């Protein structure tokens, strides 16, 4: 039954028992219920008034911290001879590329949230003359819109796409993206195929497609080359979460799938997740005096 829980539960004092037909420490795991044995039933307890708050394990607090989702470096230079990100890049938006945020998100089956996006830009001189204060444009290109082909293409005029223009000397640029799934929740996992034929992608729900982030330098190139690095952070907020999942153990292989190999030996090998001890009778860090 649903109730409001702000602090951990109190302990009541308990006495000796000795009752026939009452066995609170016996349980039946086959039902699928977890053990309902209370500490007051297992041992003699004292009264403890418990004041420990539970706010830090709220799903909102557990998930709503900003994490890196995209990092891209490119050359800001005269690109007339290059083969390359020619003063701009396109990113197909995903949340699976950096494992810290990915693993936390994958503790859940369904998530509904708004995304706070922070864009951090940094610049170095190519192998010094000072660092230029560049203007950048980030343009959100949804599904079925045309992406820019060039730094100076007319796609950047952004008649209806959301663009943010920001300087390197500014604080990091920030926008919120609304929860934009065509369903009521994102499918964090998807046991299905994207298309009506058999050749569509496994494991990606088409309902969750965000689109493209296109980022250019707006300045014309300088006589000298720079490396620009863009970092994108996402913070989920206003979060609802459903059906918690067993956590990822094996290293991720791919952003496209759940494929697994494991480490060559324990921990997190396919044959042994926990590191080995000599025997079930060995206490590995036993106190000896």
């Amino acid at each position: 039954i649903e109730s409001i829980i702000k602090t951990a539960t109190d302990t009541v004092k308990s006495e000796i028992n000795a009752e026939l037909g009452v066995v609170p420490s016996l349980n039946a795991v086959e039902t699928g219920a977890t053990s309902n044995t209370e500490p007051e039933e297992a041992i003699q307890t004292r009264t403890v008034i418990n004041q420990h708050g539970v706010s830090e394990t709220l799903v909102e607090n557990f998930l709503s911290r900003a994490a890196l989702v995209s990092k891209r470096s490119f050359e800001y230079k005269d690109h007339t001879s290059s083969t390359a990100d020619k003063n701009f890049f396109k990113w197909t938006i995903n949340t699976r590329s950096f494992v810290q945020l990915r693993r936390k998100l994958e503790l859940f089956t369904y998530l509904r949230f708004d995304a706070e996006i922070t864009i951090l830009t940094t610049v170095a001189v190519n192998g010094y003359v000072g660092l230029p204060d560049l203007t950048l444009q980030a343009m959100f290109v949804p599904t079925g819109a045309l992406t820019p082909e060039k730094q100076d293409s007319f796609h950047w005029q952004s008649g209806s796409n959301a663009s943010v223009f920001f300087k390197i000397s500014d604080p990091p640029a920030r926008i919120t993206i609304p929860f934009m799934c065509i369903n009521s929740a994102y499918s964090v996992f998807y046991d299905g195929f994207a298309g009506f034929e058999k050749n569509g992608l496994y494991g990606i729900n088409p309902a969750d497609t965000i689109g493209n982030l296109c980022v250019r330098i707006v300045n014309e190139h300088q006589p000298v080359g720079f490396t620009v690095t863009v970092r994108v952070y996402m913070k989920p907020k206003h979060i609802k979460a459903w059906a918690p999942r067993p956590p990822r153990t094996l290293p991720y292989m791919s952003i496209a799938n759940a494929n697994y190999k494991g480490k060559e030996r324990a921990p997190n090998a396919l044959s042994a997740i926990i590191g080995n001890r000599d025997s079930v009778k060995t206490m590995p860090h036993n106190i000896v005096n």
Binding site: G32, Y110, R248
Partner: protein
């Protein structure tokens, strides 16, 4: 009193004399889609007892080397009876399921099956970058076998699978498991041929053992769809 159970749905009934309660996943029960959650505006067909009945799949042999078995829903039922015909003629489907898993042996046998219903059990392949193909996933009535049950074939772990709806069959204690599944999807209905809401998994965490004379010990799976709805009447894809 919680060891004997009769399940009756449509023209089908199951009795068991050694249950261990039963699981209602997340405390939910199946229901029809209410009007305040509806998307598709055509009037649905609700076939009731024609579809809301137990279908019994082919039994699998529990053997000393067994890694476990899995079946995907609705895929395992998409070609069976009047449930399958409605699946083939309609673009959209919605239902719950009643799952009953059956395995009996002697009082001299030992063994434990974890019986777990996994929502959105998106599989991984082992030791490759290539995603699982259509024929790796879509097994139909036969179902599949686990490659690496210890990581649930998805880089995760068996040990933590009890976060999902489950019972155990412990041959010492019980010969059947029952799980009732609500509709479990982000959308209110789905195309039944390209997405599976639920995977049933049966994994022998304790292997089958005895020193009596050996017999074949089958595991049998019976599944009733519950509150089936279908929308978008069409010809059969079939």
């Amino acid at each position: 009193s919680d060891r004997v159970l009769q399940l009756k749905l449509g023209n089908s009934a199951i009795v068991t004399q050694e249950a261990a309660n039963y699981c209602c996943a997340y405390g939910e029960w199946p229901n029809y889609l209410p009007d305040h959650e509806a998307v598709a505006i055509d009037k649905p067909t609700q076939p009731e007892t024609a579809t809301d009945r137990f279908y019994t799949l082919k039994s699998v042999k529990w053997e000393t080397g067994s890694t476990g078995w899995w079946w995907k829903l609705p895929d395992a039922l998409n070609n069976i009876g009047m449930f399958g015909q409605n699946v083939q003629h309609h673009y959209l489907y919605r239902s719950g399921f009643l799952i009953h898993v059956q395995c009996n042996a002697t009082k001299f046998h030992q063994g434990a099956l974890l019986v777990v219903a996994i929502p959105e059990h998106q599989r991984g392949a082992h030791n490759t970058n290539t995603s699982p193909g259509f024929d790796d996933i879509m097994k139909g009535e036969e179902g599949g076998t686990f490659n690496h049950p210890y990581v649930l074939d998805d880089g995760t772990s068996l040990a933590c699978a009890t976060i999902f709806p489950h019972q155990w069959i412990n041959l010492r204690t019980n010969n059947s498991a029952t799980i009732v599944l609500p509709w479990m999807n982000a959308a209110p209905m789905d195309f039944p041929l390209r997405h599976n809401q639920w995977t049933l998994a049966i994994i022998p965490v304790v292997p089958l053992g005895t020193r009596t004379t050996s017999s074949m010990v089958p595991i049998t799976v019976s599944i009733a769809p519950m509150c089936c709805e279908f929308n978008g009447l069409r010809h059969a894809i079939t």
